[PDB]
Design a protein around this ligand. Structure first.
Ligand SMILES: [Zn+2]
Ligand SMILES: [Zn+2]
Ligand SMILES: [Zn+2]
Length: 178
């Protein structure tokens, strides 16, 4: 197995996947690495299995259909993996914890949002459809763009949103377009 966490790229107390060479900190993995379970398979492995069991699940889909899906176990897992892929980028630090807003010439968002809040919401099964999760994720970046206005720091929202969107299209097999 790898000797660094797959998400944060640091050493520490790592839990190793039994079916692939990845390792994780307990709370870097999503869901948090399960107490017992030998063997243990990480979220990457669990996602690969879904695909292998139903190869047609990789055919293209319309976003509007994906968003209306109920959060059954496989969709819950896919949103967990998508959230994990965002944490995998170091720039996610900016969006992880609860923000505060006191900048001359700007007003804070009506509905603040952040990664750890989305993580808790998924853990608590608060989303009934994929749309709920995706709306909260996109709200993170939209709030950032609006608040930071013409400051060049707005770009960090564009950057992390692009990671989210690419991974959303991959994980949910959105039909490719120009
Ligand atoms: Zn980690
Ligand atoms: Zn694995
Ligand atoms: Zn099938």
């Amino acid at each position: 197995n790898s000797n660094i966490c797959e998400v944060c790229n640091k050493w520490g107390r790592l839990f190793c996947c039994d079916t692939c060479p990845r390792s994780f900190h307990e709370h870097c993995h999503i869901p948090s690495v399960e107490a017992n379970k030998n063997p243990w398979s990480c979220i990457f492995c669990r996602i690969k299995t879904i695909q292998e069991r139903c190869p047609e699940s990789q055919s293209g889909h319309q976003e509007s259909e994906v968003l209306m899906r109920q959060m059954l176990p496989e969709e819950q897992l896919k949103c967990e993996f998508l959230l994990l892929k965002v944490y995998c980028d170091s720039k996610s630090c900016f969006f992880a914890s609860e923000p505060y807003y006191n900048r001359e010439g700007s007003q804070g968002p009506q509905k603040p949002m952040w990664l750890n809040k989305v993580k808790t919401s998924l853990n608590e099964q608060m989303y009934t459809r994929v749309e709920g999760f995706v709306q909260d994720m996109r709200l993170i970046f939209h709030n950032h763009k609006e608040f930071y206005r013409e400051d060049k720091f707005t770009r960090l929202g564009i950057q992390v949103q692009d990671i989210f969107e690419k991974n959303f299209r991959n994980i949910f097999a959105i039909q490719e377009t120009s």
